[PDB]
């Protein structure tokens, strides 16, 4: 199923960094011409990737990340950054080195890190 975007038993809040993650990082990446394969969870049935969940045990996508930020799901920007890293790393692990989507992920991840390098201090 889709990853959880809310959890009443997980401590969450909205920090200055987390608002930067929502209003600068996600916004910048979402507008990128390479971002669309990351907008929604990988649908291994629709995409005919029958072994996707054999190889990838912790799926993540930008749609989930954006909803978690909207729900104040995270306690720290660190947690949100790790979700982005999981999303990109999953793509490198599952797909072929020569696939377009790997190149697209590499260009998106570089922008993600550029923006994180300018995140405000907590």
């Amino acid at each position: 199923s889709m990853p959880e975007v809310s959890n009443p038993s997980k401590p969450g809040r909205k920090t200055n960094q987390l608002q930067y993650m929502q209003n600068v990082v996600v916004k910048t990446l979402w507008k990128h011409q390479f971002a669309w394969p990351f907008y929604q969870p990988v649908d291994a049935i629709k995409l005919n990737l029958p072994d996707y969940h054999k190889i990838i045990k912790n799926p993540m996508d930008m749609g989930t990340i954006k909803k978690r930020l909207e729900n104040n799901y995270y306690w720290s920007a660190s947690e949100c950054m790790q979700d982005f890293n999981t999303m990109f790393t999953n793509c490198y692990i599952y797909n072929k080195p020569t696939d377009d989507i790997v190149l697209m992920a590499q260009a998106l991840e570089k922008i993600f890190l550029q923006k994180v390098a300018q995140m405000p201090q907590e």
Binding site: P37, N48, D51, N95, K96, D99, D100, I101
Partner: peptide, 4 residues
């Protein structure tokens, strides 16, 4: 199989 695979993506693209």
């Amino acid at each position: 199989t695979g993506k693209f």
